[PDB]
Every structure is written in C-alpha cells, then in structure tokens.
Amino acid sequence: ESIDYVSFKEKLWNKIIVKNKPSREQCFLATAFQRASEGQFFVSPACDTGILDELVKDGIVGYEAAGYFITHDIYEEWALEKKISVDYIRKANNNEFFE
Amino acid sequence: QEWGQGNSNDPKIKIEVDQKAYESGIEIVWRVASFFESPFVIVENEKIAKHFFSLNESIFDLLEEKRKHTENVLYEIQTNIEFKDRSIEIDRRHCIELLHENLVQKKIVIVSGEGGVGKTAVIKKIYEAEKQYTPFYVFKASEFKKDSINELFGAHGLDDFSNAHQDELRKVIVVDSAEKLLELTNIDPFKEFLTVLIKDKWQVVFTTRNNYLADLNYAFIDIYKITPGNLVIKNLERGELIELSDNNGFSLPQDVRLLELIKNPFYLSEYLRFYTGESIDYVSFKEKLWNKIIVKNKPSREQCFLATAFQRASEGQFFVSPACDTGILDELVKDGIVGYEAAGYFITHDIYEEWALEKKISVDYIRKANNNEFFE
Amino acid sequence: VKPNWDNFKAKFSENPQGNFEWFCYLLFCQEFKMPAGIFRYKNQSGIETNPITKDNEIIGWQSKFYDTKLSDNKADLIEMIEKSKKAYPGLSKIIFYTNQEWDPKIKIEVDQKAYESGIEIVWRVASFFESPFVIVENEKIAKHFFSLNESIFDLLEEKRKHTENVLYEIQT
Ligand SMILES: Nc1ncnc2c1ncn2[C@@H]1O[C@H](COP(=O)(O)OP(=O)(O)OP(=O)(O)O)[C@@H](O)[C@H]1O
Ligand SMILES: [Mg+2]
Numbered sequence: 001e002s003i004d005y006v007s008f009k010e011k012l013w014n015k016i017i018v019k020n021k022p023s024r025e026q027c028f029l030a031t032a033f034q035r036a037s038e039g040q041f042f043v044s045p046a047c048d049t050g051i052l053d054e055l056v057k058d059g060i061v062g063y064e065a066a067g068y069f070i071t072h073d074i075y076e077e078w079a080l081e082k083k084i085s086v087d088y089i090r091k092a093n094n095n096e097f098f099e
Numbered sequence: 100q101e102w103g104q105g106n107s108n109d110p111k112i113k114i115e116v117d118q119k120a121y122e123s124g125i126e127i128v129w130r131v132a133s134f135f136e137s138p139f140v141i142v143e144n145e146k147i148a149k150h151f152f153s154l155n156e157s158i159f160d161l162l163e164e165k166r167k168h169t170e171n172v173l174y175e176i177q178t179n180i181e182f183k184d185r186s187i188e189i190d191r192r193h194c195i196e197l198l199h200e201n202l203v204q205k206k207i208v209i210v211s212g213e214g215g216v217g218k219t220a221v222i223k224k225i226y227e228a229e230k231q232y233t234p235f236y237v238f239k240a241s242e243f244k245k246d247s248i249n250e251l252f253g254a255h256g257l258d259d260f261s262n263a264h265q266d267e268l269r270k271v272i273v274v275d276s277a278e279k280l281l282e283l284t285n286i287d288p289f290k291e292f293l294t295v296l297i298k299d300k301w302q303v304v305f306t307t308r309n310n311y312l313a314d315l316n317y318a319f320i321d322i323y324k325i326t327p328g329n330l331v332i333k334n335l336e337r338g339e340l341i342e343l344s345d346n347n348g349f350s351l352p353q354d355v356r357l358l359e360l361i362k363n364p365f366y367l368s369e370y371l372r373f374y375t376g377e378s379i380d381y382v383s384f385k386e387k388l389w390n391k392i393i394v395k396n397k398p399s400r401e402q403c404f405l406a407t408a409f410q411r412a413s414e415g416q417f418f419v420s421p422a423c424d425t426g427i428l429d430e431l432v433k434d435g436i437v438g439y440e441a442a443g444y445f446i447t448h449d450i451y452e453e454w455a456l457e458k459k460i461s462v463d464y465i466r467k468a469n470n471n472e473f474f475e
Numbered sequence: 476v477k478p479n480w481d482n483f484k485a486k487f488s489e490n491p492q493g494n495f496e497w498f499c500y501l502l503f504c505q506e507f508k509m510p511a512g513i514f515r516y517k518n519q520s521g522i523e524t525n526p527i528t529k530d531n532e533i534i535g536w537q538s539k540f541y542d543t544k545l546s547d548n549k550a551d552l553i554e555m556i557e558k559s560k561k562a563y564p565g566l567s568k569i570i571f572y573t574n575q576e577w578d579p580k581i582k583i584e585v586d587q588k589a590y591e592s593g594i595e596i597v598w599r600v601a602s603f604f605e606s607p608f609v610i611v612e613n614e615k616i617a618k619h620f621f622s623l624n625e626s627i628f629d630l631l632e633e634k635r636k637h638t639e640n641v642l643y644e645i646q647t
Contacts, residue, residue: 014313020281022429022439026420029441048425086442090418104516106525108562129514133524136497137512138504142615249633258636294640322644 215365418443
C-alpha cells in the first residue's frame, strides 16, 4: 500500500538528469546552487560546451534572455540535497561544512 | 536427363532395366528432368533450388560468411598465460557452469566486471564446447554503426537469417563489449535487432563493463518485460595468487603497490613478459605501461593525468575537480584509469599515482632557476 | 498484377514458346493437384506430357503461342488431334492453351475432327488469363510472367515488417 520512494528517485535521477555524462550532473548541481545562493531566479552558469543547450532541449532547464531557470521544483529540491551530501563527504571539520 | 520416345511408349533399354528390377523384387520410380520443373521443387523449395541453379549468392553462403566472422573475432582472445615453456590457467569451471544453468532458466544473461578480468575468454571456452551441435554467433558492438540493420546481412535481410534457424530450440547470439553502444549517435538499428531476436525466441548473452549495467537491466525490464540473469567476474584474492606463485614457480613482487596491480589477469600477463633469472626488468615494464596505457599518442592525456595526481597530493583530497581540456577526463574514465562519483574524480590504481608524482618532480627539476625555488 | 503480353515478349524475347509452355505446365499442375510433376519423353509427340487419369477420364494438354488469329492456324490443330491418338490410344480429353482469341466456323471444323476421334477439346483462350484463378489465387506464379520488375513486391514486404517492428516497443 505504498511506494518505495528511494528507488523511485534513484531511477529518475539517473535516467532523466545524468543519463551517462558526468558533465550533465555537475552542470545541474551548479545551476541549482547558484540560484539558491544569489537569490536570483535567472542565472548564467559556467559549464562545458553545449551542456546547457542539451538540457534545454530535454526540457529540464528553461531559457529567456535574462538567463536560465529550472522547470520543476521537485528536481531543484533533489539537487540541493545531493549538493549537501557532497560537501559532507569532503569536509575537514564541521565548522568548514557549515561555512 | 530424359528418355526418348519409343508404359507402352517406352524404349527397349528402359524395359530391359525395368525387367531386371522386377526380377530382383524392386519397383523403380523414374524422376527425369520434368521433376525439377515442377511446383514442389520450384515454388515450395525455392531457397534450396536457388543454390544449385543460380550463380548469385544464397542462404547457405550467408550462414558460411557469418561462421567465418565468428572464427575471426575470437582468434586473438587468449585463455592462458605461457611462461618458461609452461602454461598457467585460472580455473573458471564454476562460472562456466553458472552460465550453462542461467541459459536454461532464462532468455538473456549479462556477464559483467572490470577491464582485463577475463569476460571474453569465458565466452571462448563456451564456444569450443558447442560449435558443432548448436548455432552460436558473436558480434562486436562496433558493428551496429549502420543506416539499416539489413546492411549486416548482404542482399538478404535479418528476417531471412533468423528464419534459417526456425527449427532449432537452443541457439545463441553474443554481443561483445556492450558498453561501446554508448558511442553510437543513432541507436535505432540495434533496437530493431533485439526486437526480431526476442520475437523469434533466441537466447542472448552480453559482455559489459560496470558503467552500462543499469541501462541494460532497465531496458529489458521496461520494454520487453524480461528480468535477465546477471553474473560477475572478479580479480584474484591473495591466497589464490600465493598458490599460483607456488605451484607454477614464480616469485611475487616485494612492492605492496605492485602486488595490488598483478591481481588482475591482464597485468599478471604483462609481469611475466619481463621476467628472467628470478627477477623482472622493471624499467622496461614501467616504460611499456606508461606509454601504452596512459599517454597512447596524445600530449593532452599526459598533461591531464599529471595535473590530476598533483592536485590530489597538494589538497589532501581523494575526490577532485580537475581543470582539464574539454573531453579528456571522459576518455580516461572510459579507459578505466580515472574513476567518477558525484563528489568528483579519483585515480584507480596507486602505482600510477606514484609514477605521476615522480615525473612531476623531474619536470620541476628541469625548469628550475635555483635549488631553493625548486624546493619551494 | 494484370495480363500484359508486351511485358512478356520483352522479358522472354530469346525464347517465347518455351517459356509459355512452362507457364501452362505450372498452371496445369495446380489445377489438377499434381505438385511433383508428370513424366515426359524427349521430343514427345501430340501432347506435352504423358496423360493423367481422374474419375475414369484420361486427360492431356497442349499449348501454342501465336502472332496470328487462330483461324490462320487450323492445320496445326488437325495435326495435333490426329497425332495424339496414334500414340496414346485411350485418351479422352485434351486441354488447349493459347494467347489468342477466336460462334465462328473454324472452331466447328476442328471440333468435328475431335468429335469423330472421340476426343473432347477444352479451350483456354486469352480470357482465361483474365480469370481470378490466374490473377488472384496463383498470384505468385503470374507475377513472374507479367511483371517487368518482380523484386518490387519484396520491397512492399520489407517496409510492412519494418512498421510492425517499430510499433512493438510502444505501450498503450
Ligand atoms: N583463465 C585464465 N587464466 C589466465 N589468464 C587468463 C585467463 N582468462 C583470461 N586471462 C588473461 O586475461 C586477459 C584479458 O582477458 P579478456 O580479453 O577476456 O578480458 P575482458 O574482461 O574481456 O576485458 P575487456 O573489458 O577489456 O574487453 C587475457 O588476454 C589473458 O592474458
Ligand atoms: Mg573483452
């Protein structure tokens, strides 16, 4: 009488966002964090050649002349949680992590 | 041939041979040239008749061409290591029996593991046990770069080749190095290939590295509604390598980081290529591995690898984000030298990281203005 | 497919008579259910093969490809009828195939020669090849003789099976 939620989100992240390119995953994580950090709705990220245009043709990311934005709120939440996990793995101490 | 008109109209030689047949207790049924002109030969059995009456290629010729291809593909594959006039084999009979069992219970099997571990040699040992009794064909994943799948089968189609085996219950196709399918810009011919094979009830085997494993499992479960069998092949354990060393008569290296390398059968095969007088010619081994594995023929590969190793050693970090040229880390990940995870990139073997730092020190020594600047 | 004798004459210009005979042999074997063929002597006289037997009636066949109307050819038919009974005394029926068309007088004359011989003649003139027995039932045989580009009908099978392969993936 319930869904297996961790399996659902794992299949969706790998199939829709990553596909099979490491550059796509690094691009999407950077894009979500810059919005959450600067407070801006539209951003212009630093990325490898063609990755943002490819994400726009997938419909995952949207574009207007002011910059790029993320189409679905659920995917932006998943991205922020994964970025926190990465910084937890790479820390020297707790005070650095919270900075 | 045909008889000439002289049954009441028969010529004398025919009634003489017919008389001797009867006197021996036998009836003869005569099938002269007008038999081969009839619907039984010409319309019903046209695929057989075309072999003998035509100078064009035929279905027998197609099966011959594909068998030749299978023998050519497996020629280079090595199944043992040869050393001081003696042959060394790792026992694989457990894995081979598991594969025979899976093919009875299930339609599709995936064989998986890291590079150089022996996935294709197992397939070679299956083939040598079955080539006479059963249809068995091997295709490289490189071959599906075509506009149409029928380009692989000459003037015949895929459906013709499949129909030639319709009376066989056991029949196998192997797709080899499946992770190279990620290099194709058009995947539509391969999907049609699988659709025909699933409909006609072939058994199918894949060999793959670990990066493409989930994609294969998803595709069979989502589209064709099949749960495939999975098998994993691994490097040696330390006790197994000790017994190899004792039984076959070679001494193991003293360096812990080299001992971790030769647990993989490809690298053990290289180690025993430079061995003489109960020691190894270490300089030649080092030179061959650096130039053939890491550099190949690109300067940009060597520059990227040196920068990655030094960044790890400088920052005190296992995972890093290197500032490489725009496609080189992906090429090194496909080679299996560099690894990737969501936290960053890392280096797979320790011995290569030591060698990288030593070359970096040599370069900084060549370029220095004075000794204090070098140590800084 | 549709009957076209210009296509036939363009395809089989090195030997028209010999290919028309084979077209009739295949249709005869289909009509009288003799799928493994019939015995035949070299330079066989009167009729094209040895006779068959069915419900106590004995039957043979003959074919002719002509540029003339049949009225010009009466002597061949009289010769056919007389030369057959000389060789196969019990013969009851002959079936005759041709690309031509003729009720007219000459048919009555040749029928009388057959009648006095006691032999029945059945005529398969050009309108026979307009029949659905040729065109619709035995279509695979008819396609060989009347089509300039018979391989086009394989292409119309290849695209059809391609379409079935494409839609197998789709879930409703
Ligand atoms: N049973 C065995 N005993 C000893 N050495 C073996 C054995 N099987 C394989 N090897 C060695 O391992 C090497 C690599 O084998 P193989 O080509 O099958 O690897 P693989 O797993 O298919 O690799 P790849 O992923 O690169 O295609 C062989 O060239 C041979 O030297
Ligand atoms: Mg291999």
